């Protein structure tokens, strides 16, 4: 971890649980999709649409009260496509009062850079240059 | 398509949109996670926990008003793990009054079969037998 | 039960509860209204508006985790109006691991067939014919 | 109208709409179920469970921004059951700046008076007496 | 208390809680903002926008099941601005069956009277006159 | 601005709007309450309860799509109480593709440091020392 500051930071609320009582995986995946998009828009400011998700791993349960931080690293840039590794950490306090930070979920999301009306937008070589591509 | 009847069937509501106006991908992924789980619990009735997601593809936009159907096929069964292909279709009516059914998203989700308190539960050979494994 | 496959199929989530801890009746009624509408639109593809509800019976409590299936039967068709019986079943697993399916709620909903801009649309005699009217 | 002050008073928010853009009927029915319950608990303070709904009429569309008021009249009291007429009004401002109040929906809801753990509670003759029964 | 009837009256639902299990303060503040606005629009029917909040006090916890009533008093009127004191009460039933009404939160909210497109609207001297200003 | 990194960072979604179409002030206030709490818990790890809010200013409208960042500065520490200035910024892209960052709302929130069961917890002098008090 050293992939910048979080793109998203949310509290997990009691309304975001699954029938077992843990934070619903679909709520996490929502955070991932949104956090990745913020990262991808650095290469495509107006709009991106999510085209795929690979290698998502639910490493650890998320609980009510966790502060969830979503970190992003743009991993790949094509002509219009943008790949983002998203790492989710949960910040948690136990009974004794100790703060733990747990790497909780992981994903590889791909976006396409588009015009605000949804047509393919080739990514500018300048933004690629300032991002190491 | 012929992977049984849908495991989930929901209407996409105006509250489930993204900033562009299409149905939010994270809402779809929630449907996928839940629909896969219903399929996986056929091999593990009490509880499953979602451990991973691969090969999710947002093939087509989802709109307000779409009836979303989530179909599932258990693709693989291990000692405790269960793989599920989830296919999402949107049922849609155009201006002229024509109903279209669009294969809208796709995913491969993996679950672990667990006790209601979250400990690994080896899948019974009987349920594997009646499901073709 | 033999009124086709479900028009809706949803999981009851912890966020859908009432102050007592059972699944909120208003959430169920939402499912009923939506499931009936899908059935009514078979006679009026573009749009229906809900005009009334009769004979709704909360036969049994709904719990967190239940898979709720909403079945529909078009009971009556007028010149513009459409009556639908909606039956809700909850699929549930007990402690020992046994799956139970409980007829949980019931309703008679009436819709009017309208244009996408909300004006009365007389139902086509063809759609009435292919639905036994 | 003169059935006391409203049991519920809510603003209809943009998130409470149906695919057409009007306020979702299921959201209204939620308000009705809750408003009726407040009225029924005057005869059964601890808890009521909703057992049925009759004669619900969607007289008029509800829009974003409407202030919805739910009025209640206990219509009938049995040994454990309580019938409530619920009337919903929408308070609305047009383009010119004129406030209109529209009787928007109607329902007859029945509740059973129960103990906080859900067992039938015979209604006290005193509360019946002070409510005209 | 004698500042008219409530401008809002809602049930606090289990989905409106914070990680501790009490009703989330932000949900209450939403009720306050909306209830104040209804009061302010008596001086500006079309639209108000919220410009500030002072002197909000969380006097007492709010619980699941509470009937929350929001009372309002227009405290001050300027050329375009409107100040509103909002008082929130929770109606609650204990174990023995006793109803308690608790003054639960307090706030001073300020609104600006605007045109439906958001430009400053000077408040009419007539509406000021009929409201004691 | 230089009060550390954001305590919260969320996207404003279409479901978070008011009847006018701007992001609902109550949704913002929720973000403020939560972001302040994260800051206050640095002085009281287990739990804080929100006791008051002063000097909240809605400086600018928030729109759908904005990335909202909530910054916090602990302004004052008493024996059990904690004051936090919360500043909200909206990150926004216009038509031409230009990113703007707008200071959008402001608040002074006060928390009490409590035990996980809600009793007053005197703040440790050590945590005060490492935070400049
Ligand atoms: Cl889950
Ligand atoms: Cl999109
Ligand atoms: Cl999306
Ligand atoms: Cl889980
Ligand atoms: Cl209920
Ligand atoms: Cl409608
Ligand atoms: Cl509707
Ligand atoms: Cl109940
Ligand atoms: Cl709170
Ligand atoms: Cl506004
Ligand atoms: Cl607002
Ligand atoms: Cl609290």
């Amino acid at each position: 971890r050293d992939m910048g500051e979080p793109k998203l930071k949310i509290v997990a609320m009691p309304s975001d649980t699954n029938p077992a009582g843990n934070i619903f995986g679909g709520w996490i995946l929502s955070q991932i999709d949104l956090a990745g998009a913020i990262a991808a828009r650095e290469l495509s400011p107006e709009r991106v649409v999510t085209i795929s998700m690979d290698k998502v791993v639910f490493k650890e349960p998320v609980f009510i009260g966790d502060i969830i931080s979503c970190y992003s690293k743009v991993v790949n840039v094509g002509n219009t496509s943008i790949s983002v590794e998203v790492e989710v950490t949960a910040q948690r306090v136990d009974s004794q009062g100790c703060t733990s930070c747990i790497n909780v979920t992981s994903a590889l999301v791909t976006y396409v850079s588009v015009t605000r009306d949804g047509k393919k937008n080739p990514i500018s070589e300048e933004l690629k240059r300032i991002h190491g591509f």
Side-chain angles (χ1 to χ4, degrees), chain A residues 33-34 37 48-50 111:
Chain A
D33 196 10
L34 288 172
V48 293
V49 333
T50 320
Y111 303 89

Side-chain angles (χ1 to χ4, degrees), chain A residues 17-79:
Chain A
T17 50
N18 58 29
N22 298 328
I23 298 302
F24 176 47
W27 178 89
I28 310 171
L29 256 26
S30 304
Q31 313 319 311
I32 289 164
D33 196 10
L34 288 172
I38 290 163
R41 274 194 304 274
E42 281 167 5
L43 279 144
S44 173
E46 277 97 333
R47 195 192 162 173
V48 293
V49 333
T50 320
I51 54 149
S52 67
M53 277 212 183
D54 258 275
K55 304 296 161 195
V56 3
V57 181
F58 298 99
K59 309 175 183 187
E60 218 62 46
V62 181
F63 305 140
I64 293 166
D66 291 347
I67 319 301
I68 279 82
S69 292
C70 303
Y71 299 86
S72 302
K73 187 167 165 68
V74 179
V75 152
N76 219 96
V77 180
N79 151 75

Side-chain angles (χ1 to χ4, degrees), chain A residues 73-123:
Chain A
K73 187 167 165 68
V74 179
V75 152
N76 219 96
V77 180
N79 151 75
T80 56
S81 75
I82 312 160
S83 301
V84 181
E85 184 71 44
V86 179
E87 294 287 340
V88 190
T89 71
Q91 200 183 305
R92 188 131 81 207
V93 196
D94 65 22
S95 57
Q96 266 278 47
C98 283
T99 307
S100 333
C101 172
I102 310 194
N103 186 23
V104 91
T105 136
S106 184
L108 220 200
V109 200
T110 312
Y111 303 89
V112 64
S113 117
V114 290
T115 52
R116 70 295 329 167
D117 100 322
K119 301 197 87 183
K120 279 184 176 177
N121 193 0
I123 304 160

